[PDB]
């Protein structure tokens, strides 16, 4: 389980289809084209939010760390929640992919490419005046069987999504060198990095639709219809 402090309440998260990155309204909204970039996401900091810009939503490896970050950022909030998230291939350990070039090392963040679908959120705790309400509220739409066995995406698959700038020495070195997008280490690099990250997301989103939309599939009696 991964944890994230967030001011956005459970029903809003439901309306959006998950914990979205900065500027993404609904999870399956291909309407606005998001800039997915790990390195850029790993460096920025937001007001009133734990890292969530550049198409990635940040998460902590523990409730305490998630609590600490919340207290520091959401210091003056009567209420805010800490979401409990299942591990799955849309998650990337920021320290492992960016390596020695990880901007905020010590923290140990694991980021979800494209946000976190509602069905991957196990539950949440409510935090009142900075104090955690130890009652874990369970999300009824969490896909237990599906997420039960999944893990964070291994670092190898994230290197080519690292999004280091083109002339950034990292592309000219192990292990990013073997995974550098076409044009990294002109704009080809940028558009290539964005194209790969969007492919990875679109494929993950399909795995999600296969889960949630199948619930609506109703079988037909072909012999009666025909």
């Amino acid at each position: 389980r991964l944890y994230r402090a967030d001011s956005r309440p459970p029903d809003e998260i439901k309306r959006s289809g998950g914990l979205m990155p900065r500027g993404h309204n609904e999870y399956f909204d291909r309407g606005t084209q998001m800039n997915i970039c790990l390195y850029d996401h790993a460096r920025g900091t937001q007001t009133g939010f734990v890292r969530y810009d550049d198409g990635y939503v940040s998460t902590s490896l523990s409730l305490r760390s998630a609590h600490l970050a919340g207290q520091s950022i959401l210091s003056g909030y009567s209420t805010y929640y800490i979401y409990v998230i299942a591990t799955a291939p849309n998650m990337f350990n920021v320290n492992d992919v960016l390596g020695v070039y990880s901007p905020h090392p010590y923290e140990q963040e694991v980021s979800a490419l494209g946000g976190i679908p509602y069905s991957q959120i196990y539950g949440w705790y409510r935090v009142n005046f900075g104090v955690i309400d130890e009652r874990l509220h369970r999300n009824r739409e969490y896909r237990d069987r599906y997420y039960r066995n999944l893990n964070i995406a291994p670092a190898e698959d994230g290197y080519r999504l690292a999004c280091f700038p083109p002339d950034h020495q990292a592309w000219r070195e192990e292990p990013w060198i073997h995974h550098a997008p076409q044009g990294c280490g002109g704009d080809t690099c940028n558009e290539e990095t964005q194209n790969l990250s969007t492919i990875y997301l679109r494929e993950y989103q399909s795995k999600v639709k296969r889960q949630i939309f199948s619930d609506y599939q109703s079988e037909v009696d072909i012999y009666n219809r025909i």
Binding site: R30, K209, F213, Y216, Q217, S218, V220, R225, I226
Partner: protein, 103 residues
């Protein structure tokens, strides 16, 4: 055979194409006698129906009417964006002849 919904729509009289490009706002299903139909609306105000099977339908259209109702229900539930609708405009609400969606 036709290759697009616009092309297919054009071979019938009393039809017209609506570019919806939006999900279904509401879905109504009825089993009431002589009113076994489905009605859908969009946030723009449009309302369309899948007609009760009648004499204006050839035999081959019966299984197709059932299929269309299956499609609209699941499209509504999944909140899937409808691109275009080919409808007969000599019926109120306009009657759905074809539908198209794009990803």
């Amino acid at each position: 055979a036709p290759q697009t919904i616009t092309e297919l729509c054009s071979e019938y009289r009393n039809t017209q194409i609506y570019t919806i490009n939006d999900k279904i706002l509401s879905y109504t299903e009825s089993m009431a006698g002589k009113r076994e139909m489905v009605i859908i609306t969009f946030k723009s105000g449009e309302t369309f129906q899948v007609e009760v099977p009648g004499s204006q339908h050839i035999d081959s259209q019966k299984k197709a009417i059932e299929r269309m109702k299956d499609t609209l229900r699941i499209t509504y539930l999944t909140e899937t964006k409808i691109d275009k609708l080919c409808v007969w405009n000599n019926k109120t609400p306009n009657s759905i002849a074809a539908i198209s969606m794009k990803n």
